[PDB]
Amino acid sequence: PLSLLIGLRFSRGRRRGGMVSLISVISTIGIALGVAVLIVGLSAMNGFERELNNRILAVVPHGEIEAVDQPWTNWQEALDHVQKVPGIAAAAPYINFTGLVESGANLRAIQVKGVNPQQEQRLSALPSFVQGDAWRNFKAGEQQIIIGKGVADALKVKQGDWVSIMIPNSNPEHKLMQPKRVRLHVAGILQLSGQLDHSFAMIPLADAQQYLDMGSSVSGIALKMTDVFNANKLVRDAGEVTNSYVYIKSWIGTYGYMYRDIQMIRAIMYLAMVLVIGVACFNIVSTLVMAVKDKSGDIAVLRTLGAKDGLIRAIFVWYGLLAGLFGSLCGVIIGVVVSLQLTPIIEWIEKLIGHQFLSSDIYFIDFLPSELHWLDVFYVLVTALLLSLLASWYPARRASNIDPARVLS
Amino acid sequence: CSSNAKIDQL
Amino acid sequence: KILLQCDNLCKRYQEGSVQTDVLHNVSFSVGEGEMMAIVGSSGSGKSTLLHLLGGLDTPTSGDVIFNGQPMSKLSSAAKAELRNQKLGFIYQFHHLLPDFTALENVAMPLLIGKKKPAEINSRALEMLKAVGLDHRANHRPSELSGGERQRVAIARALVNNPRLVLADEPTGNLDARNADSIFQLLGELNRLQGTAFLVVTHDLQLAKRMSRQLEMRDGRLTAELS
Amino acid sequence: KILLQCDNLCKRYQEGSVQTDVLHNVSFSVGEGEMMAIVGSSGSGKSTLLHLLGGLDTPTSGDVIFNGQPMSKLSSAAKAELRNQKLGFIYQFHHLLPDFTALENVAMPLLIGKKKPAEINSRALEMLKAVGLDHRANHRPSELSGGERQRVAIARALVNNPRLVLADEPTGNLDARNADSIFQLLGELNRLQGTAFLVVTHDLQLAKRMSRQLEMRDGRLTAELS
Amino acid sequence: YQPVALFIGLRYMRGRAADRFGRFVSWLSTIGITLGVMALVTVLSVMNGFERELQNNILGLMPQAILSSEHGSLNPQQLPETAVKLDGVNRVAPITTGDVVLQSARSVAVGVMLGIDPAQKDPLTPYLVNVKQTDLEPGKYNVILGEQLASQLGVNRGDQIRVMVPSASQFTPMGRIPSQRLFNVIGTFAANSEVDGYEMLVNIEDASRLMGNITGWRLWLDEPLKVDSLSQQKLPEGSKWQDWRDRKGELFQAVRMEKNMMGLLLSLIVAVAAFNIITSLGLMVMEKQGEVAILQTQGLTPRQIMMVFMVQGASAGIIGAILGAALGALLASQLNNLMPIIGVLLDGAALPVAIEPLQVIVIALVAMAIALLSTLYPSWRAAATQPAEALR
Ligand SMILES: *C[C@@H](COC(=O)CCCCCCCCCCCCCCC)OC(=O)CCCCCCCCCCCCCCC
Ligand SMILES: *C(=O)CCCCCCCCCCCCCCC
């Protein structure tokens, strides 16, 4: 049930001339290039966002509470109070160490922490990133330590290797008595996304209690919540059931910049590709103006047979929208095909360049993710179709102003 | 990336 | 009464940055059913006069009244509707669309009028078989010979019951073998439904079958001077 | 001696994936000053013949010698220079540039030759007043009528002292009122500076004023058969 | 009427239907190129502005390049300040460096040591908090910790530390005893950057590492982002060159890669505008076949009718690139000058810009080069066909 406005104007696109096939190829390539890259860029950004919640948000505590320069004596009462908060899912005690590793004629800046192995799997996904067979051998009094992949690569050490690391001497009298070293054997290693690998290590909580010569006392409470984007507020009221003041800190101040640098890239790319499509729309304007002044005889014929102004005005709108739609669909197909196989394409390109980008030293990850959503493809197809309709509007209006009698009808 | 603000929360 | 009335039709044209007078004091009248013929030289303004009667121009010095209604107080949409309803055009340049088939080429006037979907599949091929070209309905103008597709153009205008049919050298390319073949049904249409048609040529040999002779020289049609 | 010599011109053309023979054994000779005329049907290959004499194509089976020099041992630049110096073309399609004025359109052959800058401001309007169109020198082809700007195209080729002038239906659109008016000065050019021009038409009525009759049918021009 | 017959035959062709819309279509390629250049210039200028701030806060506060000796330390007598005249250097000062490990009464930390002469000026001098640079005297073993280094070490003025050098440890035959001393702090420096957590300033004379010589000469650079080009010049014999590409070797390599990626993304506008020229010229060639044939008959060589359409694209590309560069050099400067007309971002950081004169010229030249390159096929097709055998 095709309408007369479109009628058989698709057959009007079956024209013959000189080098007009190459013009059509350029027209369908220039507008398809700006969509196939926008689709894969938005899919790559969606993949980055998906990997951020699986490799950073799931392994980093959302909030941490610790008092001012004071060992805790009523930490259990504070844990009981913070356990019942409308918005906090779980909490666990931990100790912050700043001891350093010196073994193998190299120096490493590491932040050791002490967490309960039975409670460490209830608020984070770090247990799921252990390269070993299992971490269930974590107990108290066995000198067990686990480090990240970066530290293991720097020390060239493996599982079970004995390493002596620096430990601060927690002396009640503020002096510089002696440096402390304790030998620990590696109970496995874990590989993170590629940023916290060389700056994370943890030990059992009870071992850290003995290393500080401290009794039933911990330094910090880490908390995992449900809505991660309200962490700046959920830690404000969580620290209210305490003494006068302890500290307040969340992951927004240290990892919230990554989210701000994902939406910014999306907005920049969308604005940069709307320009690409709009410039490619001039290619439709020129080739439709040429069709208007080449099909002037048929316009006069239709006017003589009684076609109204609206029919002639709308014939070329759908004539241009078909050339735009073909290019858009060809771009959508390419963008979907490349997006679905982006991870192997980038890996194969990096093996051809020799040196690989997206390094695992200062970035967020070491690879290029790609998650395809069937809502950005619709949003870019609609944008391309709207830009094509806008481009093929003024020439269509000019086509309706052709005098049917000035040209011999 | 290359956009650092360095805003800390107390 | 009368069907068409044009008088004091002073049509100008732009020739040398001045509105040269190409038609002046045209006072011809067209009746219902009666067949006339206008004979003039190719360049005396006879071809331009045809577009003025169809509402395709503006004489800016006169008025033409069709069926008791002039085209002055009408918009472009109303003029197009009048052209599609009570008009019909036939030219000598073989003005067809080389993208449509022969069946769909003649259904365009009915397609614009938004008739029944099955009506265009019952009245178009009826006209094609009346003229005798229904076997080549599913073809292309690029395949038909010069004198073959001309009858398709003749029958294109005679679909939506045309009350008045304009013509401009209907027999310009086809030979005389089909000249009487395309005229017998045109004459019969005057007795079947009572339609009127005017034809503008430059030869007096084919005007014998016409019932009137109103040849014009430089916008004046007065007597039988030649 | 003689000015032009073409013999055994077997020009082929691509019609159906095969080089069909459209011209064969063309042995016409052109003298200095004497006027000839070639008459043929529109489709017999008479229009394609003029393109070969101007060095615009390749006969691939013969040779054309102009002023004692064949076109085989010449490059494109040499052929274009010879065309701009001792040639001239007149067509029937009204081949003019609708961007330049009437004064600039006829000065293009002089502009390509890189003559004196004030020479094109003394010889172009001289030709325009010789043909009688200097009043519309600062105009546009979109403004002039059909028969007005044709004389501009006629005078465009007759600027840089053309020794041989090809014509293809010079009187195709303009009427017979100025048909003699555009021929009197062309004839006077033969007795003024001694120029030669050949004209290819399809009618014998306007060939009376020509000094020769070499009508051709399918690449053969032998006698006065008709 | 021009002496060059090629240009006069095309100048009138750049706009022949004077109308409110017909003239606009002929300028579509110029508008597209102008947009592609004005978008390629502004964004890369903003990235250059971020890079300049990053370099002025990291590279400008750390030793950019050092000239040392391959056999450990370098004796100043064998290589004085008069013996160094390397290109791109505007200041040379003795310095000692080393990746030392801290030791406080509460915790331990790491950091690079900068042993400098207290008499000479230092880039970190203005960012001092109640500390006199002349207090760094030999024998007293004074040390100035960073603002973020002492905050995490729990160290205020009047405390003591046990800075140890593992890299330059005195490898005695009786195992391995690291070289260490007892430094007393005199205050902290706050530079409001990332170097306040691993940098501390000490006296130039220190035997905590080796040997009365120095490790090397810290030399300043006018353009510290082109060390890879200055690292191959003729250095004095018996010397080695070190730079910041060992510590900050991936951070500033990331910025260049991100700039190249953003530029490649934005170059698609210019690439599509180049295709627009190809379309606009292929449409003009097929429409002006009779004009081309008449020019060929009048005496115009095919190599001239090729340049007739070549300029039709070249002039549009040049006039688009120049306008795009001029608009990009103005939009970036006036991005937040009168009002922040950007759709104000939720950052509140006074977005910096840095217009590089060489980069704008390079972008404008690549735009012209691609516009000229895209014209080849449409111009060649207008002359490859037979003049008269095709149309007339
Ligand atoms: C961390 C970010 C930093 O990126 C930035 O550069 C921040 C830029 C902020 C710019 C603000 C500009 C404000 C003014 C705008 C004015 C616009 C004017 C427009 C005309 C009027 O990291 C990144 O953003 C990296 C982003 C990478 C994005 C994707 C690049 C994809 C490249 C694909 C190339 C495919 C090539 C295929 C060839 C076949
Ligand atoms: C900035 O502070 C950290 C940014 C971490 C992610 C950097 C990603 C760089 C590469 C982005 C590529 C986007 C397009 C991918 C498909 C071509």
Author numbering:
A (entry chain E): 4 to 412
B (entry chain V): 1 to 10
C (entry chain F), D (entry chain D): 3 to 228
E (entry chain C): 2 to 212, 217 to 397
Paper lines:
The cryo-EM structure of the lipoprotein-bound LolCDE complex reconstituted in nanodiscs was determined at a resolution of 3.5 Å, revealing a conformation highly consistent with the previously reported structure of lipoprotein-bound LolCDE in detergent. The lipoprotein is bound at the interface between the transmembrane helices (TMs) of LolC and LolE via its triacylated, unstructured N-terminal segment. Specifically, the triacyl chains and the initial (+1 to +4) residues of the lipoprotein are situated in the central cavity formed by the TM1 and TM2 of LolC and LolE, with the remaining segment extending outwards from the interface towards the periplasmic domain of LolE. Interestingly, this observation aligns with the length of the lipoprotein segment resolved in the LolCDE-lipoprotein structures, which spans from the central cavity to the periplasmic neck of TM2 in LolE. The remaining structured body of lipoprotein has yet to be resolved in any reported LolCDE structure, reflecting the flexibility of the unbound portion. The structural surface of the complex reveals highly hydrophobic patches surrounding the central cavity formed by TM1 and TM2, as well as the interface created by the gate loops extended between TM3 and TM4. Each of the triacyl chains (designated R1, R2, and R3) binds specifically within these hydrophobic pockets. The thioester-linked acyl chain, R1, is situated in the interface enclosed by the gate loop of LolC, while the amide-linked acyl chain, R3, and the other thioester-linked acyl chain, R2, are accommodated in a larger pocket enclosed by the gate loop (formerly known as the door bar) of LolE. These specific interactions of the lipid chains and peptide linker to the complex indicate that the LolCDE extracts lipoprotein in a fixed orientation, allowing each structural element of the lipoprotein molecule to be precisely recognized by different domains of LolCDE.
Lipoproteins, anchored in the OM via their N-terminally linked fatty acyl chains, are key OM components that play essential roles in OM biogenesis and maintenance of its integrity. Depending on their roles, mature lipoproteins are either retained in the periplasmic leaflet of the IM or transported to the OM by the localization of lipoprotein (Lol) pathway, which consists of five proteins LolA-E25. LolCDE forms an ATP-binding cassette (ABC) transporter in the IM, which sorts and transports lipoproteins destined for the OM by consuming energy from ATP hydrolysis. In this study, we determined the cryogenic electron microscopic (cryo-EM) structures of endogenously captured lipoprotein- or ATP-bound LolCDE reconstituted in nanodiscs.
